Amino acid sequence: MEDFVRQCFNPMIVELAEKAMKEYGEDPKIETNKFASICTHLEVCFMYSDFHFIDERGESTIILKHRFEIIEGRDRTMAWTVVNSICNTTGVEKPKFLPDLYDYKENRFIEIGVTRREVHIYYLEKANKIKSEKTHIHIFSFTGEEMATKADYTLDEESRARIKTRLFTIRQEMASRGLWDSFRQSERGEETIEERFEITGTMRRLADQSLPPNFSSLENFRAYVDGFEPNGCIEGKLSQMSKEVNARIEPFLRTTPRPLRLPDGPPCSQRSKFLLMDALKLSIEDPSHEGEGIPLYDAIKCMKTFFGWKEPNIIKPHEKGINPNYLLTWKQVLAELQDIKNEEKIPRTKNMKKTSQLKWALGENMAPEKVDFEDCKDVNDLKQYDSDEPEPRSLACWIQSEFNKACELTDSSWVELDEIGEDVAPIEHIASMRRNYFTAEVSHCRATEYIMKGVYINTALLNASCAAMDDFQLIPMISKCITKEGRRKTNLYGFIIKGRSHLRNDTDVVNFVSMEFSLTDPRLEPHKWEKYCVLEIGDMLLRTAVGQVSRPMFLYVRTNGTSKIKMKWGMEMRRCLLQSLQQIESMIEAESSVKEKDLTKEFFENKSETWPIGESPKGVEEGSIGKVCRTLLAKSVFNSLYASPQLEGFSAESRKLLLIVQALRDNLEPGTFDLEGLYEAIEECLINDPWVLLNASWFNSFLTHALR
C-alpha cells in the first residue's frame, strides 16, 4: 500500500504529501490511508491546474499565465497569504475555509475533492461544511462519477476525461493489489482515520486473567514491559537456583556401554503375509497353450502338471479356528478346479459359491453387534476394550535362517526392468555399465523373488477387489521367470480367496484366505506357524543323489486381512531395489573421489576388496560387493515385509547410541548426561517383533565387536 503509493505516483508529489503530513506530527509508516488520500488529493489538484493558460485576449487556452492557481499544496501561512493577495487584487470575498484552486478566467475559488463513496453525498457534506455560496465545488469519484455546482464544470471534456480516467486506473490498480477495500473503508465523511483494533469485552477479561501472578491488568503488564531494562535478572536467578539443576557430563570410555536386553518369553512366531523360504511352486517351463496369459488358465495348466492329490488331513491345527472348515475350503477349491477343468469354457475369472466354510473363513458376519451403552450398561461382563501389554517373546532362530536364505541367489531371473533411451553421453554409458552390473548382481536374488511375487499378488488382489465388489473371487498366486535356458517359465505358489470387497476407506480391511503350497513340516517348529493351518495335500518326488525320494507336500492355509493402503505398499516393494543401490553407489563414488577415477570395474569385477558383512564362530566375516548388494537388498525387502512401529522406534532411538560409540571410536572424547535414559528408551521398543529382536541382537554383536 505504502509501497504502491510510492511507486505509482510522481515522487515529488510523494514528497509534498510527506511534508504536509509531517506538519501535523504524523509518520506515514504508521498511517498510510491518510498518506494515500493526501497523495490522491495533490495528484488531482495538480492535474486540474495543468495544461491551462490565459491567451493574449484573456481567453482560455490549452498547452503566459496559468489560468488555475494551486493553494492546497502550500503551507498554512503561504496559502493564507496567497488567498488574501487574490482577494485584494481581484476584489474577491474571503471564503470561510481554505479553498484548493483559484480559477482566474472566472475569478473564483474552487474546492476539489476525490471521494471513494458516492459523489452526491460528498457534495452535500462539503456544501454543509463550507456554508458559503462564493466557493465552487468539484467532486470526483474513482468509479467515473463527478459533480459540481449547476453542472458548470470549468474544464473541457478532454481534461475531465483525463482526471476521471486517472482515478479509474488508480482504483483498478488498488483493487488488483488488494487494498481498495481498506481505502474505501477508511473514508469517514470528510476525514481518513487510522485502522483501529481494540480489545474490549470478553478479550479484556481473558487478558486480565492471562498475565503473570504479580500483575492484574493487561495495561499494567504492558507498562511494566515497556519500562523494563536488563539489570542482572538472569545472573541473580542463576545465583539463587540450587546447584542440583545442572547438566553434568558423564564420561563415556570403552567400559560404560552394555548390550540391550531382549524381552523374555516364548519364541516369536512368523507373521509374514506369505511364505518366504518354505514355499513350493508348480512350474510350467513354456506356457504355449491356448488362451495363455489369463491367471486362471496358467494356474490350471500348472495344476495339471502335478499328480499326488491325496486325502488332506489337519497336520498343524489352527489353535483358534475350526480346522475342518479350512479342510472343506481346500476341498471346495479342488472340486471347483475339477469342475471348471471339465467345463471346457474357462472364463477370465472364477467366482466361488458362498458356503458355510467360506463365509466363516473370511470372517463374514463374525462381528459383535453395536448397541447403545446405556441400553446394555447393566451387563456385568461389560468392560473397556482389551488393550493390555502385548505378550513379550524371545528371538527365535527362524528369522536369521529366513534372512540368510533371502540374501542368496536363485536359478532364474526375477526382474524384467523396462527399457530406456539409448545412451549417448559418456556419463550415460558409465551409468548403463553400473546399472547393468548391479542388475546382474541382484537379478536372481531371493529378495527379488519376494518382490515379484508380492507385486503380482497385490496387483491381482486389488484389481479383483475393484472389479468384483460382491463376489468371492479365486485368485491364483502366479509369477513369471526366466530360466538359465532363457525360457518364459510360470510358477504357481498357491491360491487366494478374497471376501467382501465393499471397501470405502483406505484403512478398512478386506479379509482373505491364502493357501500356499509348501514342503516343510510345521511340526518341526510349531511356534513358527501358530497362525497357519497345514493340510498334507500330496506327495512329491524330489531328486537327490539317492534317486527320487517321496516327501509330503503340505498346503498352508491361513486367514489374513489387507487394507488398500497395505495393498499399495505391497505393490511399491519394487522401490526396495533402488534403496540398495543408493547405499552402494555412494560408496563407489566415495572411493572415486579419493582416487579421482572410476571404480565400477575394480569393484564389480575385482572380487578382492571386501567389507565385514556378517559373523561366524571364527570371527567377523568379510564379503565382496555382491554379498553386500544382496544383503542390503534383502534387508530392504524384509523391512518392507516386516514393517512395524517398534522397528522405527528402535531404529530412531538406536541411531543415537551408534553415533555416540562411533564418536568414541574417532577419539572425540564423547560424553553423555543420562545414558541410562537412552538405554531405557531403546529397550522399550523390543516386545514381540521377530525383525526388531533380530536387529537388537545384531546391535549387541556390533557393540561387542567395536568395544574391543
Partner 1 sequence: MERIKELRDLMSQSRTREILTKTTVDHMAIIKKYTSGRQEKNPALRMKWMMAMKYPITADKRIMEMIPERNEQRQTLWSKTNDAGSDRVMVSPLAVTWWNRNGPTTSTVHYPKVYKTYFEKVERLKHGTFGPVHFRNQVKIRRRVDINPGHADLSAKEAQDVIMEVVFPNEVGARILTSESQLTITKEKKKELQDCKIAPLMVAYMLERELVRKTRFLPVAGGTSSVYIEVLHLTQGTCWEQMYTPGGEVRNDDVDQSLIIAARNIVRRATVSADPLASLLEMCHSTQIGGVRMVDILRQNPTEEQAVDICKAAMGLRISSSFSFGGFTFKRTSGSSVKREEEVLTGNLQTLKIRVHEGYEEFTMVGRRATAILRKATRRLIQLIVSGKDEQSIAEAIIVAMVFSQEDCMIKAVRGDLNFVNRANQRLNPMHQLLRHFQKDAKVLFQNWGIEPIDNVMGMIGILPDMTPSTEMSLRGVRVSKMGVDEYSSTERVVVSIDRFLRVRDQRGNVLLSPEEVSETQGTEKLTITYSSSMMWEINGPESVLVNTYQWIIRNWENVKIQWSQDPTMLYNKMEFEPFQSLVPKAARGQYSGFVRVLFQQMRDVLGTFDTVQIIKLLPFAAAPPEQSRMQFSSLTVNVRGSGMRIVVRGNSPVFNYNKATKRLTVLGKDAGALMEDPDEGTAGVESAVLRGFLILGKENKRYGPALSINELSNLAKGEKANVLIGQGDVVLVMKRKRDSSILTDSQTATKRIRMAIN
Partner 2 sequence: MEMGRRIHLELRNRTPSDVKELVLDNSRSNEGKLEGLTDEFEELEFLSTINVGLTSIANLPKLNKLKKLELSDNRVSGGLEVLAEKCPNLTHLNLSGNKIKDLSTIEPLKKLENLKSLDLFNCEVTNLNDYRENVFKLLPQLTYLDGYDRDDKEAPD
Report which residue type is found at 343.
Answer: E
Joined together, the cell numbers standing for residue 413 give 531371473
Q: Examine residue 561 and tell whether it contacts partner 1 (CB under 8 A).
A: no
**Contact positions toward a second copy, by CB under 8 A?**
306, 308-310, 312-319, 321, 323, 326-327, 329-330, 333, 361-364, 378, 380, 396, 398, 429, 511-513, 515, 522-523, 525-541, 553-555, 601
Q: Shortest Cβ distance from residue 401 to partner 2 (Å)?
A: 4
Establish whether 100 is an annotated binding residue. yes
Q: Examine residue 542 and tell whether it contacts partner 1 (CB under 8 A).
A: no
What distance in Å separates the CA atoms of residue 663 and residue 667, rounded to the nearest whole number? 7
544 binds, among partner 2, a second copy, partner 1, none (CB under 5 to 8 A by kind): partner 2
**Subset of residues 43 to 62 that bind partner 1, contact rule: CB under 8 A:** 43, 45-47, 49-51, 62
Q: Which of 4, 180, 679, 702 binds partner 1 (CB under 8 A)?
A: 180
What are the backbone angles phi and psi of residue 450, rounded to the nearest 5°? -55, -45
Please, what is the Cα angle at 411 between 405 and 415, to 5 degrees? Answer: 90
Q: 606-620: b or e for each residue (b if 16 or more CB lie within 10 Å)?
A: eeeeeeebeeeeeee
522 binds, among partner 2, partner 1, a second copy, none (CB under 5 to 8 A by kind): a second copy
Please, what is the Cα angle at 449 between 693 and 272, to 5 degrees? Answer: 35
Q: Which of 545, 618, 666, 676 binds partner 2 (CB under 8 A)?
A: 545
Q: Examine residue 324 and tell whether it contacts partner 1 (CB under 8 A).
A: yes
| Displacement of CA 437 from its chain's centroid (Å) | 34
Q: Shortest Cβ distance from residue 225 to partner 1 (Å)?
A: 23
Q: Which is nearer to partner 2, 63 or 545 (CB)?
A: 545
Q: Examine residue 323 and tell whether it contacts partner 1 (CB under 8 A).
A: yes
Q: 32-49: b or e for each residue (b if 16 or more CB lie within 10 Å)?
A: bbbbbbbbbbbbbbbbbb
Q: Examine residue 547 and tell whether it contacts partner 1 (CB under 8 A).
A: yes
Count of positions on this chain that bind partner 2 (CB under 8 A): 11
589 binds, among partner 1, partner 2, a second copy, none (CB under 5 to 8 A by kind): partner 1
Q: Which is nearer to partner 1, 146 or 449 (CB)?
A: 146
**Subset of residues 517 to 536 that bind partner 2, contact rule: CB under 8 A:** 521, 524
> In the sheet where 108-115 sits, what is the strand order?
68-70, 101-103, 108-115, 135-141, 146-148
Q: Which of 77, 88, 214, 365 binds partner 1 (CB under 8 A)?
A: 365
Burial of 600: CB neighbours in 10 Å, binned 0-12, 13-18, 19+ = middle
Q: Which of 589, 605, 609, 669 binds partner 1 (CB under 8 A)?
A: 589
Count of positions on this chain that bind partner 1 (CB under 8 A): 90
What distance in Å separates the CA atoms of residue 578 and residue 435, rounded to the nearest whole number? 11
What distance in Å separates the CA atoms of residue 197 and residue 203, rounded to the nearest whole number? 12
Q: Mention every residue, 6+ apart, whose C-beta is less than 8 A from residue 389.
A: 687
Q: Examine residue 455 and tell whether it contacts partner 1 (CB under 8 A).
A: no
Establish whether 111 is an annotated binding residue. yes
Q: Which is nearer to partner 1, 225 or 367 (CB)?
A: 367
Q: Which is nearer to partner 2, 466 or 541 (CB)?
A: 541
Q: Shortest Cβ distance from residue 506 to a second copy (Å)?
A: 20
Q: Shortest Cβ distance from residue 393 to partner 2 (Å)?
A: 20
Q: Which of 58, 232, 547, 619 binds partner 2 (CB under 8 A)?
A: 547
Contact between 172 and 145 under an 8 Å Cβ cutoff? The reply is no
Establish whether 41 is an annotated binding residue. yes
Helix (H), strand (E), coil (C) string for 458-484: HHHHHHHHHHCCCCEEEEEEEEEEECC
Task: Kindly give the residue spans of alpha helices, DSSP state H, lying in 305-397.
Answer: 323-343, 356-361
Establish whether 536 is an annotated binding residue. no
463 binds, among a second copy, partner 1, partner 2, none (CB under 5 to 8 A by kind): partner 1
Q: Shortest Cβ distance from residue 300 to partner 2 (Å)?
A: 25
Q: Examine residue 542 and tell whether it contacts partner 2 (CB under 8 A).
A: yes
Report which residue type is found at 562.
Answer: T
What distance in Å separates the CA atoms of residue 206 and residue 203, rounded to the nearest whole number? 5
Q: Which stretch binds partner 2 (CB under 8 A): 136-144, 153-161, 308-316, 537-545?
A: 537-545
What distance in Å separates the CA atoms of residue 39 and residue 47, rounded to the nearest whole number? 12
Q: Examine residue 519 and tell whether it contacts partner 1 (CB under 8 A).
A: no
Nearest one of 658, 452, 424 to 574, comparing CA atoms: 452
**Subset of residues 71 to 110 that bind partner 1, contact rule: CB under 8 A:** 73-74, 78
- Residue 287 in 3-state DSSP? coil
Q: Shortest Cβ distance from residue 28 to partner 1 (Å)?
A: 11
Contact between 601 and 430 under an 8 Å Cβ cutoff? The reply is no
DSSP label at 320? S
Joined together, the cell numbers standing for residue 34 give 491518510
Joined together, the cell numbers standing for residue 70 give 494551486
What distance in Å separates the CA atoms of residue 556 and residue 75, rounded to the nearest whole number? 100
Establish whether 106 is an annotated binding residue. no
Q: Which stretch binds partner 2 (CB under 8 A): 104-112, 411-419, 449-457, 542-550?
A: 542-550
Residues that bind partner 2 (CB under 8 A): 397, 400-401, 521, 524, 542-547
Which segments are annotated as binding site?
Answer: 41, 72, 100, 111-112
Binding residues for Mg(2+): 41, 72, 100, 111-112
